[PDB]
Amino acid sequence: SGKIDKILIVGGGTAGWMAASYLGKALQGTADITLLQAPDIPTLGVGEATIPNLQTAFFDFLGIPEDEWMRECNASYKVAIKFINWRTAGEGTSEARELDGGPDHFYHSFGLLKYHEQIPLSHYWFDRSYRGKTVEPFDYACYKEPVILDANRSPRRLDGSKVTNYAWHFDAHLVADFLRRFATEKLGVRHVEDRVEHVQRDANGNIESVRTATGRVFDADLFVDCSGFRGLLINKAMEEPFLDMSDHLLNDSAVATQVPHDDDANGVEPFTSAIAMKSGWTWKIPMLGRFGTGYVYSSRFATEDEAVREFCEMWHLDPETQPLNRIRFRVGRNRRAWVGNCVSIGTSSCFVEPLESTGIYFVYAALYQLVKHFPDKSLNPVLTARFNREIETMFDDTRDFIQAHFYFSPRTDTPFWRANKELRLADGMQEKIDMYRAGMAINAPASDDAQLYYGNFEEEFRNFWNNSNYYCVLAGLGLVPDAPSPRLAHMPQATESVDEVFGAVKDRQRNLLETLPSLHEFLRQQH
Amino acid sequence: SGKIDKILIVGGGTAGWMAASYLGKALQGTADITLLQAPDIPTLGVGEATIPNLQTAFFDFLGIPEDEWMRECNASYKVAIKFINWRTAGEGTSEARELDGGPDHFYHSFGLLKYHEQIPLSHYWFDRSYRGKTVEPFDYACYKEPVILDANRSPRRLDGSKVTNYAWHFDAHLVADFLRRFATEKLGVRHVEDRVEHVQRDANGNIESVRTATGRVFDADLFVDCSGFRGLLINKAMEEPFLDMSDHLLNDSAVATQVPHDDDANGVEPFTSAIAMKSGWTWKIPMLGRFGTGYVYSSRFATEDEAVREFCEMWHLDPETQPLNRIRFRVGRNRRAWVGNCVSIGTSSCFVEPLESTGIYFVYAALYQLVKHFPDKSLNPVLTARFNREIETMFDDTRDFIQAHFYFSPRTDTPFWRANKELRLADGMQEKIDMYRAGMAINAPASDDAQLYYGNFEEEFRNFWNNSNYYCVLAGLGLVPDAPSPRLAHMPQATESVDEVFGAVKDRQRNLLETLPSLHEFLRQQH
Ligand SMILES: Cc1cc2nc3c(=O)[nH]c(=O)nc-3n(C[C@H](O)[C@H](O)[C@H](O)COP(=O)(O)OP(=O)(O)OC[C@H]3O[C@@H](n4cnc5c(N)ncnc54)[C@H](O)[C@@H]3O)c2cc1C
Ligand SMILES: Nc1ncnc2c1ncn2[C@@H]1O[C@H](CO)[C@@H](O)[C@H]1O
Ligand SMILES: N[C@@H](Cc1c[nH]c2ccccc12)C(=O)O
Ligand SMILES: N[C@@H](Cc1c[nH]c2ccccc12)C(=O)O
Ligand SMILES: [Cl-]
């Protein structure tokens, strides 16, 4: 035995520099860490969207205040994903089509639905809706956010005070750079810029060393594969199978760019947009004076050329002239994330389309779990197996949630939208849908206190997709229960007094619409 | 087909009047509830021990102040279970044998272990123990309670202020009677004294009505089976299989009585005792001026006559003339707790020996789950299946935990203690043990805040047997990890600073021991 003394991280980029920073912090002064990465053709900054626990689980762990990193990474704010045109037929367009007297949009906001008499607000909304007491959409009824986001309001007042839960939009290249500087200058991580040419394994099949193009040899007790979709160590050297999951997710490709934006004329949207297309969907990630955008599509339904044309047409770009990243993804996860002394982190481990902003989350969630299940040199098999279980659940739950965005869309207008209805939901997901249709909450949060949830990683990891999230997406798409929760007919006092809860939301919608600065005004001050 | 209009509860006792009270409260004014019970030969009050969520999940739900019910039921206080003679060979005796320089006892107390730098105190204790920095037992190192329980201290100061988490000892008959008065007088529950003679089912297999010995016919939409081990409705009428769990639990019998106690001469113990015997264990449940006591034993290893002698000799009672309850238990659970329109609640549903004070908890836990999954007359099968899943798990996790008390005892002195080592642990339990031996937390609480835990039934129910409970019992019996958590060697600042955490336990131990009144002194004032 003996403790792990030496760690080698293969791969720079976002996953590698997060691994370096997180492990550098968690093990400070008790492990020697080297990061090895090949300088290679850089890509356009197409923007990344994130979730609130980035600050609480990751940057707060490193001891880095939000102000410091967000200014270094020219970050903007995200209060929701705005799902546009998921219910209406037609071409890929940036503009919401008309549906039932209003624009075809719904929001998936941060935070938790309020409990009223032990029951989530969603259930009272649906009861009122089903019985014809309201025609208001779920999101406008139950959340203060949709009204303020429509007006492009800031989540913070000019004095700094926070009025809602929020996360960040940034170019991931800037965060990687920031973290490289942090790990190397403050945590003692050694940075080697060289290309892996050969991986030597021992008779147990564990990694012994890595040899580079220059002939340099690096050994370690633990190897962290951050090599991206290649899986240099986990797939290639350790021969661990990748599990494709295109039986749940048709999308496997993207064409992506960055588009200049006049924030003075137009303001800045405090949300990511997920814009439904003919054969996939397009993201819009507003940053400072630019937005990142990418058409995520299914290569089985659109050629690369059709996707390039569709995408450029929507943003009025010239396909001959616009800088484009064309990407084919690996969709799914390794059979096992950690094998022997090789732990995969980032896209070497797993990947799903960025429909719910989970990419960066999967990196620091895995790093949290790695540290929790941290081995010594005997590599206790129970630690590895438990870590692998946490990763497979983290990923599979997300794969299911995302499939549900396509599966329950009402659209039948293209081969793509119809083909989605013909895939099967995983058993676990079918069960959640059955519960939802019976009027049950799905993974209701133990408390409705958002600070408990976003302030405690263990609490959020156990309840990652919660009832609020399922209702936003399912009810947004138009999937609703077969009938109201049977409980509510036995609670006349509760269904009466819930009216004040809805009034309270209406009050916050009105007062925040009147008092909040624009996101653009706040960003100018903040940066 | 419409809301449930009528509910018939079959069976009184504790489970039936809890069901009546809880449903009467939950559905007040929107369902007609009748409880049907035949008068039966009454038993000696042999005592019941409970857990803190009795007040917060049951009596607080009903609107009943702790002071009110406890004075009506002549209740005492419980701070822990004290396990006596589980590690040493010999006869069934009320006196602890010597082990390693002190008495053979350990405590399973209420509360949660403190987290230090994200890691439960248990892990720091074991690190120190393993490296020979301490020989102090786990319970004495990590809990303030053992010291004050050794001195029979009150959990409340004379001014009423609470210094620890605690629950109750009482004669269950007094609680059943208190609840009968409450439900009939405050909640409009109809009480009918009659004996079920016939259960009429329809062609869907649902119960239509029950006919009594007087010829009265009681119909309802939902039938609650609180008939006890007989399972009048769920087993006899609905023919639901009962799963015997004697491959995990050998104890199936008890002989029990009540002993007068002079509390002025001797004081009152603020704990349940669980006293290891040759072929089982004996409870001691202090009440006011008396204790309830019962030898739980395996009919495979002792005859009724033998258990009677061992039990009576322990307490110096005449086996020929002492009033005794001779009980054969039905150990295990139904394949399904709820079938068609018939829900089992209490021992008609499931039973395990009272080794961890779960019997009353299983009643209001299931009642909370019933209201959560409450049907209308269409009896949506998803509600029933999900309720059944929550009940299976609540029971099977308790079965597993209880089995571990016998399986990990070091005793080999009687056929009984040896035979327990020849049984298998369930897969899910073996997995927990594997994790524990690897130095992992088992079901670490999301938070170490006991108020959030005991004040939020969802939080507690999802994490019912937590890391604290596993360490009290496993480490108490002497099962410890193979090696310290490998994480800790990378945390030299945390393993240094945890000394203040152990020192604070020691300060609370000393200060509470010096300032607390006896349990008996507080009870005189309280009652
Ligand atoms: C289309 C797209 C959109 C996304 N959108 C979002 C989003 O909105 N929100 C979000 O949170 N996440 C998003 N993500 C996920 C996120 O971008 C990634 O997890 C992360 O930012 C980058 O992945 P990575 O670091 O694992 O891999 P990579 O960036 O591919 O890094 C690979 C590294 O490995 C090194 N390497 C490989 N082979 C060798 C070798 N032979 N020798 C030496 N070095 C080697 C490379 O040099 C490089 O340093 C998105 C991802 C994609 C693909
Ligand atoms: N045949 C029956 N009719 C009515 N109540 C019953 C019957 N059998 C058992 N019970 C009730 O179940 C409880 C036993 O724990 C008692 O209230 C008892 O009256
Ligand atoms: N637990 C996550 C769920 C989530 C992931 N991506 C999201 C995007 C929008 C809203 C919620 C989410 C959160 O509330 O942060
Ligand atoms: N979650 C329960 C666990 C428990 C059941 N029986 C116990 C007896 C003693 C201590 C804890 C328990 C509690 O803390 O109440
Ligand atoms: Cl993503």
Coordinates of N, CA and C in Angstrom, one line a residue, chain A residues 208-346:
Chain A
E208 N 1.3 1.9 -16.2 CA 2.6 2.0 -15.6 C 3.2 3.4 -15.9
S209 N 3.2 3.8 -17.2 CA 3.7 5.1 -17.6 C 3.2 5.5 -19.0
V210 N 3.5 6.8 -19.3 CA 3.1 7.4 -20.5 C 4.5 7.9 -21.1
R211 N 4.7 7.7 -22.4 CA 5.9 8.2 -23.1 C 5.4 9.2 -24.1
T212 N 6.1 10.3 -24.2 CA 5.6 11.4 -25.2 C 6.4 11.4 -26.5
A213 N 6.0 12.1 -27.5 CA 6.6 12.3 -28.7 C 8.1 12.7 -28.6
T214 N 8.4 13.5 -27.5 CA 9.9 13.8 -27.3 C 10.7 12.7 -26.6
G215 N 10.0 11.7 -26.2 CA 10.7 10.5 -25.6 C 10.7 10.6 -24.1
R216 N 10.0 11.6 -23.5 CA 9.9 11.8 -22.1 C 9.0 10.8 -21.5
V217 N 9.3 10.2 -20.4 CA 8.4 9.2 -19.7 C 7.9 9.7 -18.4
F218 N 6.6 9.6 -18.2 CA 6.0 10.0 -17.0 C 5.3 8.8 -16.3
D219 N 5.6 8.6 -15.0 CA 4.9 7.6 -14.2 C 4.0 8.3 -13.2
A220 N 3.0 7.6 -12.6 CA 2.2 8.1 -11.6 C 1.6 6.9 -10.9
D221 N 0.9 7.1 -9.7 CA 0.1 6.1 -9.0 C -1.3 6.1 -9.5
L222 N -1.8 7.2 -10.0 CA -3.2 7.4 -10.5 C -3.1 8.3 -11.7
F223 N -3.8 7.8 -12.8 CA -3.9 8.5 -14.1 C -5.3 9.0 -14.3
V224 N -5.5 10.3 -14.7 CA -6.8 10.9 -14.8 C -6.8 11.2 -16.4
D225 N -7.7 10.5 -17.0 CA -7.9 10.7 -18.5 C -8.8 11.8 -18.7
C226 N -8.3 13.0 -19.1 CA -9.0 14.1 -19.6 C -8.7 14.4 -21.1
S227 N -8.5 13.3 -21.9 CA -8.1 13.4 -23.3 C -9.3 13.7 -24.2
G228 N -10.5 13.9 -23.7 CA -11.7 14.2 -24.6 C -12.2 12.9 -25.2
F229 N -13.0 13.1 -26.3 CA -13.6 11.9 -26.9 C -12.7 10.8 -27.3
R230 N -11.4 11.0 -27.7 CA -10.4 10.0 -27.9 C -10.3 8.9 -26.8
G231 N -10.6 9.3 -25.5 CA -10.3 8.3 -24.4 C -8.9 7.6 -24.5
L232 N -7.9 8.4 -24.7 CA -6.5 7.9 -24.8 C -6.1 6.8 -23.8
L233 N -6.5 7.0 -22.6 CA -6.2 6.1 -21.5 C -7.3 5.1 -21.3
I234 N -8.5 5.6 -21.0 CA -9.6 4.7 -20.6 C -10.1 3.8 -21.7
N235 N -10.3 4.3 -22.9 CA -10.7 3.4 -24.1 C -9.5 2.8 -24.8
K236 N -8.6 3.6 -25.2 CA -7.5 3.0 -26.0 C -6.5 2.2 -25.2
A237 N -5.9 2.7 -24.2 CA -4.9 1.9 -23.4 C -5.6 0.8 -22.5
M238 N -6.6 1.2 -21.7 CA -7.3 0.2 -20.8 C -8.3 -0.6 -21.5
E239 N -8.7 -0.2 -22.8 CA -9.6 -1.0 -23.6 C -11.0 -1.2 -23.0
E240 N -11.4 -0.2 -22.2 CA -12.8 -0.2 -21.7 C -13.8 0.3 -22.8
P241 N -14.8 -0.5 -23.0 CA -15.8 -0.2 -24.0 C -16.6 1.1 -23.7
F242 N -16.7 2.0 -24.7 CA -17.7 3.0 -24.7 C -19.1 2.5 -25.0
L243 N -20.1 2.9 -24.2 CA -21.5 2.5 -24.5 C -22.2 3.6 -25.2
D244 N -22.4 3.5 -26.5 CA -23.2 4.4 -27.3 C -24.7 4.3 -26.8
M245 N -25.3 5.5 -26.7 CA -26.7 5.5 -26.3 C -27.6 6.2 -27.2
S246 N -27.4 6.1 -28.5 CA -28.2 6.7 -29.6 C -29.6 6.0 -29.8
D247 N -29.8 4.9 -29.0 CA -31.1 4.4 -28.9 C -32.0 5.3 -28.0
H248 N -31.4 6.3 -27.3 CA -32.2 7.2 -26.5 C -32.1 8.6 -27.0
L249 N -31.0 8.9 -27.7 CA -30.6 10.2 -28.2 C -30.2 10.2 -29.6
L250 N -31.0 10.8 -30.5 CA -30.7 10.8 -31.9 C -29.6 11.8 -32.2
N251 N -29.5 12.9 -31.5 CA -28.5 13.9 -31.9 C -27.1 13.5 -31.6
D252 N -26.2 13.7 -32.6 CA -24.8 13.2 -32.6 C -23.8 14.2 -33.2
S253 N -24.3 15.4 -33.5 CA -23.5 16.4 -34.3 C -23.9 17.8 -34.0
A254 N -23.0 18.7 -34.3 CA -23.2 20.2 -34.2 C -22.5 21.0 -35.2
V255 N -23.1 22.1 -35.6 CA -22.4 23.1 -36.3 C -22.5 24.4 -35.5
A256 N -21.4 25.0 -35.1 CA -21.4 26.0 -34.1 C -20.5 27.2 -34.4
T257 N -20.9 28.4 -34.0 CA -20.2 29.6 -34.2 C -20.4 30.6 -33.1
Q258 N -19.7 31.7 -33.2 CA -19.9 32.9 -32.3 C -20.3 34.0 -33.2
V259 N -21.4 34.7 -32.7 CA -22.0 35.8 -33.5 C -21.8 37.2 -32.7
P260 N -21.2 38.2 -33.3 CA -21.2 39.5 -32.7 C -22.6 40.0 -32.3
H261 N -22.7 40.8 -31.2 CA -24.0 41.2 -30.7 C -23.9 42.7 -30.2
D262 N -24.8 43.5 -30.7 CA -24.9 44.9 -30.2 C -25.7 44.9 -28.9
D263 N -25.0 44.8 -27.7 CA -25.7 44.8 -26.4 C -26.4 46.2 -26.1
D264 N -25.8 47.3 -26.7 CA -26.4 48.6 -26.5 C -27.7 48.8 -27.1
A265 N -27.9 48.2 -28.3 CA -29.1 48.4 -29.1 C -30.2 47.4 -28.5
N266 N -29.7 46.2 -28.2 CA -30.6 45.0 -27.9 C -30.7 44.5 -26.5
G267 N -29.8 45.0 -25.6 CA -29.7 44.4 -24.3 C -29.1 43.0 -24.4
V268 N -29.1 42.3 -23.2 CA -28.6 41.0 -23.1 C -29.6 40.1 -22.4
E269 N -29.9 39.0 -23.1 CA -30.8 38.0 -22.5 C -30.2 37.2 -21.3
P270 N -30.9 37.3 -20.1 CA -30.5 36.5 -18.9 C -30.9 35.0 -19.0
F271 N -30.8 34.4 -20.2 CA -31.2 33.0 -20.3 C -30.4 32.4 -21.5
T272 N -30.3 31.1 -21.5 CA -29.9 30.3 -22.7 C -31.2 30.1 -23.5
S273 N -31.1 30.1 -24.8 CA -32.2 29.7 -25.6 C -32.0 28.3 -26.2
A274 N -33.0 27.5 -26.2 CA -32.9 26.2 -26.9 C -34.0 26.2 -27.9
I275 N -33.6 26.4 -29.2 CA -34.5 26.8 -30.3 C -34.7 25.5 -31.1
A276 N -35.9 25.0 -31.2 CA -36.1 23.8 -31.9 C -36.0 24.0 -33.4
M277 N -35.4 23.0 -34.1 CA -35.1 23.1 -35.5 C -35.8 21.9 -36.2
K278 N -35.6 21.8 -37.5 CA -36.2 20.6 -38.2 C -35.6 19.2 -37.8
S279 N -34.3 19.2 -37.6 CA -33.6 17.9 -37.3 C -32.7 18.0 -36.1
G280 N -33.2 18.8 -35.1 CA -32.4 19.0 -33.8 C -32.9 20.2 -33.1
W281 N -31.9 20.9 -32.5 CA -32.2 22.2 -31.9 C -31.0 23.1 -31.8
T282 N -31.2 24.4 -31.7 CA -30.0 25.3 -31.7 C -29.9 26.0 -30.3
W283 N -28.7 26.0 -29.8 CA -28.5 26.8 -28.6 C -28.1 28.3 -28.9
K284 N -28.4 29.1 -27.9 CA -28.0 30.5 -28.0 C -27.5 30.9 -26.6
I285 N -26.3 31.2 -26.5 CA -25.6 31.5 -25.2 C -25.1 32.9 -25.2
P286 N -25.9 33.9 -24.7 CA -25.4 35.3 -24.7 C -24.2 35.5 -23.8
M287 N -23.1 36.2 -24.3 CA -22.0 36.6 -23.5 C -21.9 38.1 -23.6
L288 N -20.7 38.7 -23.4 CA -20.5 40.2 -23.5 C -20.3 40.6 -25.0
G289 N -21.2 41.3 -25.6 CA -21.0 41.7 -27.0 C -20.9 40.7 -28.1
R290 N -21.4 39.5 -27.7 CA -21.4 38.3 -28.6 C -22.4 37.3 -28.0
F291 N -22.9 36.4 -28.9 CA -23.6 35.2 -28.4 C -22.9 33.9 -29.1
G292 N -22.9 32.9 -28.3 CA -22.4 31.6 -28.8 C -23.6 30.9 -29.3
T293 N -23.5 30.2 -30.4 CA -24.7 29.5 -30.9 C -24.2 28.2 -31.6
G294 N -25.0 27.1 -31.6 CA -24.7 25.9 -32.2 C -26.0 25.1 -32.5
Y295 N -26.1 24.6 -33.8 CA -27.2 23.7 -34.2 C -26.8 22.3 -33.8
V296 N -27.4 21.7 -32.8 CA -27.3 20.3 -32.5 C -28.2 19.4 -33.3
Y297 N -27.7 18.5 -34.1 CA -28.6 17.8 -35.0 C -28.2 16.3 -35.1
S298 N -29.1 15.5 -35.8 CA -28.9 14.1 -35.9 C -28.4 13.8 -37.3
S299 N -27.2 13.3 -37.4 CA -26.6 13.0 -38.7 C -27.5 12.0 -39.5
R300 N -28.3 11.2 -38.8 CA -29.2 10.3 -39.6 C -30.4 11.1 -40.2
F301 N -30.6 12.4 -39.9 CA -31.7 13.1 -40.4 C -31.4 14.3 -41.2
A302 N -30.2 14.9 -41.1 CA -29.7 16.0 -41.9 C -28.3 15.7 -42.2
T303 N -27.9 16.1 -43.4 CA -26.4 16.0 -43.8 C -25.7 17.2 -43.1
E304 N -24.4 17.2 -43.1 CA -23.7 18.3 -42.6 C -24.0 19.6 -43.4
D305 N -24.2 19.5 -44.7 CA -24.5 20.7 -45.6 C -25.8 21.3 -45.3
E306 N -26.9 20.4 -45.2 CA -28.2 20.9 -44.8 C -28.2 21.6 -43.4
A307 N -27.5 21.0 -42.5 CA -27.4 21.6 -41.1 C -26.6 23.0 -41.1
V308 N -25.6 23.1 -41.9 CA -24.8 24.3 -42.1 C -25.8 25.4 -42.7
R309 N -26.5 25.0 -43.8 CA -27.5 25.9 -44.4 C -28.6 26.3 -43.5
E310 N -29.3 25.4 -42.8 CA -30.3 25.7 -41.9 C -29.9 26.6 -40.8
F311 N -28.7 26.4 -40.2 CA -28.1 27.2 -39.1 C -27.8 28.6 -39.5
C312 N -27.1 28.7 -40.7 CA -26.7 30.0 -41.2 C -27.9 30.8 -41.6
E313 N -28.9 30.2 -42.3 CA -30.2 30.8 -42.7 C -30.8 31.5 -41.4
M314 N -30.9 30.8 -40.3 CA -31.6 31.3 -39.1 C -31.0 32.6 -38.5
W315 N -29.6 32.6 -38.5 CA -28.9 33.7 -38.0 C -28.4 34.8 -39.1
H316 N -28.9 34.5 -40.3 CA -28.5 35.4 -41.5 C -27.0 35.5 -41.6
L317 N -26.3 34.4 -41.5 CA -24.8 34.2 -41.7 C -24.6 33.7 -43.1
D318 N -23.4 34.1 -43.7 CA -22.9 33.6 -45.0 C -22.2 32.3 -44.8
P319 N -22.7 31.2 -45.4 CA -22.1 29.8 -45.0 C -20.6 29.7 -45.6
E320 N -20.3 30.5 -46.6 CA -19.0 30.5 -47.3 C -18.0 31.3 -46.5
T321 N -18.4 32.1 -45.6 CA -17.6 33.1 -44.9 C -17.5 33.0 -43.4
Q322 N -18.7 32.6 -42.8 CA -18.8 32.5 -41.4 C -17.8 31.4 -40.9
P323 N -17.0 31.7 -39.8 CA -16.2 30.6 -39.2 C -17.1 29.6 -38.5
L324 N -17.0 28.3 -38.9 CA -17.8 27.3 -38.3 C -17.0 26.2 -37.7
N325 N -17.4 25.7 -36.5 CA -17.0 24.4 -36.0 C -18.0 23.3 -36.4
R326 N -17.5 22.3 -37.1 CA -18.4 21.1 -37.4 C -17.9 20.0 -36.5
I327 N -18.8 19.4 -35.8 CA -18.4 18.4 -34.7 C -19.3 17.2 -34.8
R328 N -18.7 16.1 -34.7 CA -19.4 14.8 -34.6 C -19.1 14.3 -33.2
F329 N -20.1 14.0 -32.4 CA -20.0 13.6 -31.0 C -20.1 12.1 -30.9
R330 N -19.4 11.6 -29.8 CA -19.7 10.4 -29.1 C -20.8 10.6 -28.1
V331 N -21.9 9.9 -28.2 CA -23.0 10.1 -27.3 C -23.2 8.8 -26.4
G332 N -23.1 9.0 -25.1 CA -23.2 7.9 -24.1 C -22.1 7.9 -23.1
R333 N -21.7 6.8 -22.6 CA -20.7 6.8 -21.5 C -19.9 5.5 -21.5
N334 N -18.7 5.5 -20.9 CA -17.9 4.3 -20.7 C -18.7 3.3 -19.9
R335 N -18.5 2.0 -20.1 CA -19.0 0.9 -19.4 C -18.7 1.2 -17.9
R336 N -17.4 1.5 -17.6 CA -17.0 1.9 -16.3 C -16.1 3.2 -16.5
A337 N -16.4 4.2 -15.6 CA -15.6 5.5 -15.7 C -14.2 5.4 -15.2
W338 N -14.0 4.5 -14.2 CA -12.7 4.3 -13.5 C -12.4 2.8 -13.6
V339 N -11.2 2.5 -14.2 CA -10.8 1.1 -14.4 C -9.3 1.0 -13.9
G340 N -9.0 0.1 -13.0 CA -7.7 -0.1 -12.5 C -7.2 1.2 -11.8
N341 N -6.2 1.8 -12.3 CA -5.7 3.1 -11.8 C -5.9 4.3 -12.8
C342 N -6.9 4.1 -13.7 CA -7.3 5.1 -14.7 C -8.7 5.6 -14.4
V343 N -8.8 6.9 -14.1 CA -10.2 7.5 -13.9 C -10.4 8.5 -15.0
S344 N -11.5 8.3 -15.8 CA -11.9 9.2 -16.8 C -12.8 10.4 -16.3
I345 N -12.5 11.6 -16.8 CA -13.2 12.8 -16.3 C -13.5 13.7 -17.6
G346 N -14.7 14.1 -17.8 CA -15.1 15.0 -18.9 C -15.6 14.1 -20.0

